[PDB]
Amino acid sequence: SNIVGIEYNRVTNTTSTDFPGFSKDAENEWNVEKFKKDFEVNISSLDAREANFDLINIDTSIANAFRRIMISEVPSVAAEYVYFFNNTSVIQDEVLAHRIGLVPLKVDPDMLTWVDSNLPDDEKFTDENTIVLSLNVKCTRNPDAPKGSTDPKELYNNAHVYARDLKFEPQGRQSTTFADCPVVPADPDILLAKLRPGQEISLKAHCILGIGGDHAKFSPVSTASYRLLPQINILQPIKGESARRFQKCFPPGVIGIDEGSDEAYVKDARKDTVSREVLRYEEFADKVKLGRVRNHFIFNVESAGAMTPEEIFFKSVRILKNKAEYLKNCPITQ
Template identity: 35%
Template sequence: MSVDLITILLGLLMSCIPVALTCLYLLSWITPWPIRTRKDFLQPMFVYAPVNPWNEKFRSLLSYDDSSGEELHCTTPDLYLSVIVPAMNEQERLPIMLDECLPYLEGRQTKDDLFTYEIIVVDDGSTDRTADTAYKYTEKYEGKIRVLKLEKNLGKGGAVRRGVLCARGSLILFADADGATKFADLQHLEEELLGLTTLDGYVPEIRSDVNWITPAIAIENECIFCFSSRSHMEKKSIATRSLARTFLMIAFHWIVYIFTVRTVRDTQCGFKLFTRGAVSKLFPLLHIERWAFDVELLFLAEQFSIPIREVPVTWHEVDGSKIVPIISWLQMGRDLILIWFRYKTGIWKTMSGSPRRSRRKSEQNAENKLVMDAERVLNTYDTDSDFGNSTIQWDVTAYISEIKIFIVNESKDGMTLEFDLVGVEAPIANAIRRILIAELPTLAIEKVYLYQNTSIIPDEVLSHRFGLLPIKADPRLFKMPLTRVIGIDESGVDCSEEPAGDPTSGYQSVISLPHFRIHHQWCMMIFWLRNYDLDKRLKLGECHCLKGLGRDHAKFSPVATASYRLLPQIVLKKKFSGADARRVKSSFSEGVIEIDADGVAFVKDARSDTCSRNILRYEDLAEYIELSRIKDHFIFSVESTGALRSAELVVEACKVMEEKCRTLQSLFQKRLKELQ
């Protein structure tokens, strides 16, 4: 009888699965959700004013270029920090929150002139005087606080999205209008976030120079955001929360963990800090505009592998919540399940166009790892044979769609660039590096005419140094000399083109080629100087440069350095504390491993690891630590010699590779036609 009962129960359970799926499809079909298009994100938004509400226009965070297809681009920031405050019928609580945050922000600006900020209060269709209450602060803080009034109530998520898409800051914070979180705790979020945006993990001294991750050339930009958390209050009892709210919080967190977000304990804390790149990446993809929008936001961040950090804050419960008991709870539960269901089935898609995968992330990436052993590197082959698996159909469109580029760091002058290239094989990455070194043309001094050299530097050395001088001229404006040999006569000028003399010019140099002439001011030896007296002044025709390739001579190479490495990964398979934690930390480069407040070692920045295997010296530790590299994630570092910006050099290298591929393709097609 027991066996029959179990069989009956299993049968009932199996029969319930199709019913449950059908119910979910029906629930998804009958549940309305707003469809936002590019037009909605780019529509002009105006600053609210009681007298003339349509006078000043907000500057949009997103821009659109017809040449980029459907892609939206992130505009450059004007300020350091934007604070977005969604408010609906908050005329009583809003002044308390603003009276706390404005003195703090003003104090920061007084101490640091580079700290600039704005506050945007988004009135989400209020029926009271919320907008007018916020507008009163604009008289005292002119230009620093503005009001965006929405005619219809969109929900908290919709209000936050409208607000952040009007933000001008490099960092964007959205904070609830109830003031439940201590605003001064912003500095904790800020320090953690700025540490994530730097290569070494340390907070820069000049905070206004934050790397906000420009996504202009990225398919998928590596952007970061950081938010506060109240989860630590469960142990420390800092929060004062009612019993009913505590029960609902625990139940909500369990539902969130089961269906959507598993890496974050507190998804609903209304104090979140973003980089500008993160906002432009995530908010256009949101579908939920009510209370559960935070969950979808974090869910998408997980899909894009955006680093998320929870930072403890001081929080207290404030009366006046807009959540309607039972109804709001049911809506949030429904939205959580539908977030999981719609992304799981592909009804909703991320930017890459693929629904969430069901396998664990570690299982997905296992085959894409190069495992670092003591004496060897494991998992270097993609297949278990000497030949590729030709039975698998390869689609170039699908392959290209998986390629991603992240701009990690770029110097102010554009001469140095670090970026990540993801989704390609090593031969492609190596080809880009070799093209940067040897296939991109630049200008260099080809011949030197010396007459009565009075310096202590020999003629040969001086001529050699002249040849290595970086010529600050755009090589794209010049043509290759091909087989033409440019002669130089006894006056040091091109035999085929005698430049006209200019008696008013005593120190101009001319790059003289058959079709063009360009002037520069420069000094002897290695350095370019603009406003210094010159010991030697060159007249027209006394300097000749030639366009060439690095493969012909190193002086034509446009890069000082061009290198790449694979993205490191470090997995600690057990908790290391005490002396073991200190040994683990000392075995890696500084900043890679850190020790938390409980004395437990954790991986802070695996990216900074330099492929050190020092940890393998400790046999008692090595077996619990996995060192690996991601096969298709390349960290590029490019430094230009000065002719073009590093980013321009990378683009030119891709153009050269494209031309080579087209040439090879045409040769194959020609040969195939001959064989037919």
Template identity: 30%
Template sequence: MLHLYHTADVERKVEEEEGEFKMKLTLVKKKKGKLTFDVSGTTPAYINTLRRVFMTHVPTMAISTVEFRQNSSSLYDEMIAHRLGLLALKTDLKSYNVPEKGAPESAATHATLTLKTVGPKIVYASELKSSDSKIVPVYPETPITVLLDHQELEFVATAHLGFGRDHAKWSTGLVSYYYKPKITVNNKSAKFAEFINKYPSQIKSKGTIDADKIDTAELIDACKDICEDIVKIEYSENQTDFIFTIESWGQLSPEEIVEEGIKQYDAQLDEFKKLVKDI
């Protein structure tokens, strides 16, 4: 028998006939815009569900429509609009709502960004003037287009909340996972001098290999086939342990992505439960 618990709980339980599993989460690394967790006691299906939820089911702000009033640059309106749509915008989930189909626009559903300028110059995202000081480009030095002498560009852009499942411009970032291996390092191996130069420099410390620095899927792949007598990488048959990474594009912090993603997932579970009851 399967029992569902909200993912907002400190520990999520999944009880099955075979026994009980408890998911545990430990912070491995934290830096600006990126979080890495050690997740144990779960399944590939569930960890991949979280990955998809965090990437495509968390709303972010992005430009969805552009009204051009003047454009004498070398780029078509459509090309500039496409570039504007892909600008990452700081997102304020407390002040804005996802617009409903057919509902009129309101201050709670959209923000306006305007630009009016004349060449010669490179037009950057920093020149956009927002109706809300919180909704601004994450990367202000992103170039939009180049204007030559006397060329003009003027437009009004409207930004809405949306989901990555509908368009990539609303994606929150890169979310990935890989199976957590057991890494054994033997710095006293007889083959150490022969193979040490073949290992990535990132994992070396004072002439030895530091197992703690083999902390990404790329470094694990780079090390696994060089010499098992020096670096041995093993995977358990019972694959329930993972390294889970969230790297934000900047609209939201990784912490906000996790918090909002869990809310969205819980809401979907509640809706599913209601639909099942109505059958």
């Protein structure tokens, strides 16, 4: 079977069993035509920052590879070096640099070139491989302030250094390439720092592109994950008040009661988060069986704002294909 059964104390049938050698029939040999016929993609939602889509009739290894590549192998642009001029804040320089490196930047990674590490620092950063962001905030006491006010936004002028203060400074040909798509943070309301009068922040951040495995600030996804499609089988009819109890073991939109026969039936198993409450009660034993479809993945890819989640998934598929091609083209050394 292909249904991961869910019991009250254990999870059964979790390993894929589609390969020759599993049975004497010697079936499930790799055929690209059968996979092309069986594989399906169903898009349920496609927003600017979130995509939800079902992959049907694909193996667990490939879906997990897609998830891992989206998390740690798809490049994105984040701040890497911070040069400080007169950081007078109570926030330390290391903490402020870390926070600036953690903001997401709305830069297409395809427009930047990878930075050669072995090159010296005098010629390491070019206009093709570095984006310079300037921050300059001074806090002054407000003269036209309310008499009895206590809000920091009225007693002071720049008491909150936000992410939108990271202005973009074009360098060289970036004045033309970045003309229609200026560099802005994806979340301009990020509270980078708080100030009081007499305090000043002035800094230049060099931003490069890297992969999420090196540092978590380069991951282009808020979260990239999948969950198998739940499956509830009502083996025997459940009628009457118990059916109402059978409705309370699940989220409200999962299982409904027919008006005519007054019996419970599954309405939307997608909403069914597996809390396995129904297995606690002895009255529903030998009446309900829970499982998950092993080859029905529901990907929910939430982007960090740099680029669209569908682009992230496409880049992950392309990265896996390029890894396979690179290993195929390499010679084998003894």
